[PDB]
Amino acid sequence: GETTDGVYRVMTRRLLGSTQVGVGVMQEGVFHTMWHVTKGAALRSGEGRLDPYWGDVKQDLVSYCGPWKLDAAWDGLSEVQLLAVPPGERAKNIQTLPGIFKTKDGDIGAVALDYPAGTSGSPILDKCGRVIGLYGNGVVIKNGSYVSAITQGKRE
Amino acid sequence: DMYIERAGDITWEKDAEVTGNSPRLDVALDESGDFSLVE
Numbered sequence A: 001g002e003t004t005d006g007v008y009r010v011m012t013r014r015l016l017g018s019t020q021v022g023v024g025v026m027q028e029g030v031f032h033t034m035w036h037v038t039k040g041a042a043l044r045s046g047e048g049r050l051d052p053y054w055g056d057v058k059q060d061l062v063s064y065c066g067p068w069k070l071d072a073a074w075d076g077l078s079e080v081q082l083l084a085v086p087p088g089e090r091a092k093n094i095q096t097l098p099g100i101f102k103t104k105d106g107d108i109g110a111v112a113l114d115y116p117a118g119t120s121g122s123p124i125l126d127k128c129g130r131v132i133g134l135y136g137n138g139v140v141i142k143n144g145s146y147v148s149a150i151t152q153g154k155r156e
Numbered sequence B: 001d002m003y004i005e006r007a008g009d010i011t012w013e014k015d016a017e018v019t020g021n022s023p024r025l026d027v028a029l030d031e032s033g034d035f036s037l038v039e
């Protein structure tokens, strides 16, 4: 099917009409998304099939057709860009300065933007346009809002 | 059965909408990859 580099919508026809369950990045013949979007199920791209290659429920990441290729990371200083791909709406870049998720295993980036759960998998970019992580896994704060972490995989 | 559709190129766009705050949150990650606020 289509394996051109870029950002893609993850849809399903299992419910009423076509519903967007998430987003993903195609880079170097590998489609990268969040595990909670596809649950490790095979994906379709026209007549072609995309089979899972790597996945981890704790990291909440999954790769298709090959190993994880995205290796860039937030510098802890600069403003990033969430390339948001919302259900039924056109892709839109939103520049923001991330906060920090402080954990027992180290600090991670965190973008505080408000989008439907179906926006999960949309890439977060650095000034060079490099994917420094995926948007869609985080926490609910005091005002009911969602704050997502910047989730990156490991390149071997 | 899930399927993918192209939604565009991945590039940084200058003069984009600049919004969102930067909060520092003490969190915990469980075995299921689910985050939770620590207090």
Ligand SMILES: Cn1ncc2c(C(=O)Nc3ccc4c(c3)CNC4)cc(C3CC3)nc21
Binding pocket: A036, A060, A115, A116, A117, A118, A119, A120, A135, A136, A137, A138, A146, A148, B032, B033, B034
């Ligand atoms: C506003 N809002 N409310 C909920 C959500 C979620 C969400 O449920 N993520 C999720 C679900 C299941 C699992 C994991 C994450 C990881 N383990 C399994 C995602 C987003 C993304 C746009 C930010 N917004 C949400």
